[PDB]
Amino acid sequence: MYDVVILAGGLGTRLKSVSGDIPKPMVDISGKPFLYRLMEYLEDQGVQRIILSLSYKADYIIDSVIKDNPVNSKVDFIIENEPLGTGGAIKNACKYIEASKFIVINGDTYCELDYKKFIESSLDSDLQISGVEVDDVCRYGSLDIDHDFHVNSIVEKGRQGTGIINSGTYILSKKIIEDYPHDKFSFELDFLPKFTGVFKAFVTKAYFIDIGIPEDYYKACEKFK
Ligand SMILES: Nc1nc2c(ncn2[C@@H]2O[C@H](COP(=O)(O)OP(N)(=O)O)[C@@H](O)[C@H]2O)c(=O)[nH]1
Ligand SMILES: [Mg+2]
């Protein structure tokens, strides 16, 4: 099983009328932080090394895990004094990774993915994204892929009916990004438009929630009792 980088350094929730102070991955989900439930699932999947890539309120998150760590996997921390963006965060985490490939997950997402099958599907690529097929994709960003599942573009939310959720979970070869010329950048907005290698989606019907979406918060609290 690959090393996992969890991106958890962004600000609190930002909705049209509501702004949060707590980091989104630390929202309480029926007695445990959302992040803890993600980490527990990863440990169940065989993950032995988790890197938490932090910035906003990094000391709050670390202090929480020092006191109550839900897993026995190794847990490393990397603190960004100034937010490096999602892409800069990944580039920065490459320092810690000795292997040629690793997993990136957004800390505000919880997906009951089969990571062994995801790794197998990624063997012939340097970048693979997890796409989640749902009957109603309206509240999610989605993926525009062709009939070989090559990713053509990322689509903004606001689309009724079926679609493939842009999960933000990737398997990548660190060589594609470790030496990206900028230290601060967005993975989706700066890196992906430039990347010229093979980029396909692993598409499954896995359970998916994004804790930044209010309806998914209620779904999560109900799911975990
Ligand atoms: N370490 C780090 N993480 C970040 C940064 N920006 C965002 N993140 C994290 O990366 C994930 C995705 O962030 P973002 O794409 O901005 O959020 P979204 N999917 O648009 O709501 C979140 O879990 C967030 O905490 C950053 O500058 N540094
Ligand atoms: Mg969000």
The β-bridge partners of 172 are 102, 127
CA distance 14 to 22: 11
3 state SS of 148: coil
Residue ID of nearest Cα to ligand 1 atom 11: 106
Contact yes or no for 144/153 (Cβ under 8 A):
yes
Ligand whose nearest atom lies closest to the CA of 141: 1
Distance 59 CA to ligand 1 centre (A): 17
Residue ID of nearest Cα to ligand 1 atom 17: 10
As a residue count, the chain comes to 225
Distance 167 CA to ligand 1 centre (A): 12
The β-bridge partners of 127 are 172, 199
Q: Which atom of ligand 1 is nearest to the CA of 184?
A: 27
Distance 2 CA to ligand 2 centre (A): 25
Which has the closest alpha carbon to 112: 26, 7, 208? Answer: 208
Domain boundaries, the chain: 1-225
Q: Which atom of ligand 1 is nearest to the CA of 55?
A: 1
Only one residue has tokens 């010229």, namely 196
Which has the closest alpha carbon to 48: 71, 74, 66? Answer: 74
CA distance 108 to 214: 12
Residue ID of nearest Cα to ligand 1 atom 28: 9
CA distance 60 to 33: 12
- Please state the φ and ψ torsions of residue 138, each to the nearest 5 degrees: -55, -45
Contact yes or no for 202/122 (Cβ under 8 A):
yes
Q: Which atom of ligand 1 is nearest to the CA of 25?
A: 23
Residue 142 neighbours by CB under 8 Å, 6+ apart:
154, 155, 157, 159, 163, 164, 165, 166
Distance 216 CA to ligand 1 centre (A): 17
CA distance 87 to 180: 9
Distance 197 CA to ligand 1 centre (A): 24
Pairing between β-strand 151-155 and β-strand 142-145 as defined by DSSP bridges: antiparallel
Is the four-CA dihedral 156, 27, 206, 78 of positive or negative sign? positive
Contact yes or no for 183/84 (Cβ under 8 A):
yes
What are the respective helix, strand and coil percentages of the chain, to the nearest 5? Answer: 25, 35, 40
Ion ligand 2, residues whose Cβ is below 5 A away: 212
Q: What is the DSSP annotation of 6-55?
A: EE--S-EEE-SS-EEEEEGGGSEETTEEHHHHHHHHHHHTT--EEEEEE-
Query: What residues line ligand 1, using a CB cutoff of 6 Å?
Result: 7-10, 53-55, 80, 83-86, 89, 106-108, 168, 212
